[PDB]
Amino acid sequence: SVKIFSMLEKFGQFHWFYGISIGQFLSCFKRVFIKTRVDEILWLLYQEVYCQFSTALD
Protein backbone atom coordinates (compact mmCIF):
# COMPACT_ATOMS: atom_id res chain seq x y z
CA SER A 1 0.00 0.00 0.00
CA VAL A 2 2.88 2.38 0.74
CA LYS A 3 4.39 1.67 -2.66
CA ILE A 4 1.07 2.19 -4.45
CA PHE A 5 0.42 5.46 -2.61
CA SER A 6 3.89 6.73 -3.51
CA MET A 7 3.22 5.89 -7.16
CA LEU A 8 -0.09 7.76 -7.06
CA GLU A 9 1.62 10.80 -5.54
CA LYS A 10 4.21 10.72 -8.32
CA PHE A 11 1.30 10.66 -10.78
CA GLY A 12 -0.21 13.69 -9.07
CA GLN A 13 3.10 15.50 -9.45
CA PHE A 14 2.82 15.60 -13.25
CA HIS A 15 -0.64 17.16 -13.61
CA TRP A 16 -2.72 19.20 -11.19
CA PHE A 17 -5.79 17.02 -11.80
CA TYR A 18 -4.07 13.74 -10.86
CA GLY A 19 -3.63 14.39 -7.14
CA ILE A 20 -4.63 11.80 -4.57
CA SER A 21 -5.73 12.08 -0.96
CA ILE A 22 -5.11 9.61 1.86
CA GLY A 23 -8.70 9.28 3.04
CA GLN A 24 -9.71 8.37 -0.51
CA PHE A 25 -7.08 5.63 -0.64
CA LEU A 26 -8.07 4.33 2.79
CA SER A 27 -11.76 4.20 1.83
CA CYS A 28 -10.88 2.39 -1.39
CA PHE A 29 -8.93 -0.15 0.66
CA LYS A 30 -11.82 -0.50 3.13
CA ARG A 31 -14.15 -1.37 0.26
CA VAL A 32 -12.09 -4.56 -0.24
CA PHE A 33 -13.51 -6.48 2.71
CA ILE A 34 -17.18 -5.68 2.07
CA LYS A 35 -17.06 -7.15 -1.44
CA THR A 36 -3.37 -17.61 1.94
CA ARG A 37 -5.99 -15.13 3.11
CA VAL A 38 -3.34 -12.38 3.15
CA ASP A 39 -2.48 -13.04 -0.49
CA GLU A 40 -6.15 -12.84 -1.45
CA ILE A 41 -6.48 -9.53 0.39
CA LEU A 42 -3.38 -8.17 -1.36
CA TRP A 43 -4.72 -9.20 -4.77
CA LEU A 44 -8.11 -7.66 -4.01
CA LEU A 45 -6.39 -4.47 -2.87
CA TYR A 46 -4.52 -4.20 -6.17
CA GLN A 47 -7.66 -4.85 -8.22
CA GLU A 48 -9.82 -2.40 -6.28
CA VAL A 49 -7.19 0.35 -6.32
CA TYR A 50 -6.74 -0.01 -10.08
CA CYS A 51 -10.45 -0.05 -10.90
CA GLN A 52 -10.95 2.92 -8.55
CA PHE A 53 -8.17 5.30 -9.59
CA SER A 54 -7.77 4.38 -13.26
CA THR A 55 -10.91 6.31 -14.21
CA ALA A 56 -9.27 9.50 -12.89
CA LEU A 57 -6.39 9.27 -15.39
CA ASP A 58 -6.18 9.69 -19.16
Side-chain angles (χ1 to χ4, degrees), residues 6-8 10 12 16-17 22 25 27-36 38 43-44 51-53 55 58:
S6 71
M7 175 196 77
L8 291 187
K10 284 204 200 305
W16 55 266
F17 192 71
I22 183 56
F25 183 85
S27 167
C28 174
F29 166 81
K30 288 191 201 216
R31 210 180 43 242
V32 160
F33 305 87
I34 289 143
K35 182 187 196 169
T36 54
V38 167
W43 185 79
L44 277 182
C51 76
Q52 180 68 41
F53 302 114
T55 75
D58 59 313

Side-chain angles (χ1 to χ4, degrees), residues 44-56:
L44 277 182
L45 165 68
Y46 265 88
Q47 304 282 335
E48 271 283 337
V49 159
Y50 177 76
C51 76
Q52 180 68 41
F53 302 114
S54 79
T55 75

